[PDB]
Amino acid sequence: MAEALFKEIDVNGDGAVSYEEVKAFVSKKRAIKNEQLLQLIFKSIDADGNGEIDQNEFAKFYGSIQ
Questions:
Q1: Between 35-45 and 19-27, two packed helices, what is the crossing angle to 10 degrees?
Q2: Which of 44, 56, 59, 66 gives 3 a disulfide partner, CB atoms 3.0 to 4.6 angstroms apart?
Q3: Which of 40, 34, 46 has the alpha carbon at shortest distance from 6?
Q4: Residue 14: Cβ within 10 Å count
Q5: Cα separation of 65 and 28, whole Å?
Q6: Is residue 21 a known part of a binding site?
Q7: Assigned CATH topology for domain 1-66
Q8: Which of 3, 7, 32, 29 is nearest to 17 (CA)?
């Protein structure tokens, strides 16, 4: 309902979503090729930006747009 979506999309059960995984997630809703937005959003969504966003980072990031 909130963060479960991040772990839900991770069919690989890795609890980590990289830049590619992110772009794909949104791609499942439509077709929007954003190279700039992907890069920026990638580092933004990722708390540590370590290759991919971990469940923990995503959870703490979710709703942290205050």
A1: 120
A2: 59
A3: 46
A4: 13
A5: 23
A6: yes
A7: Recoverin; domain 1 (1.10.238)
A8: 7
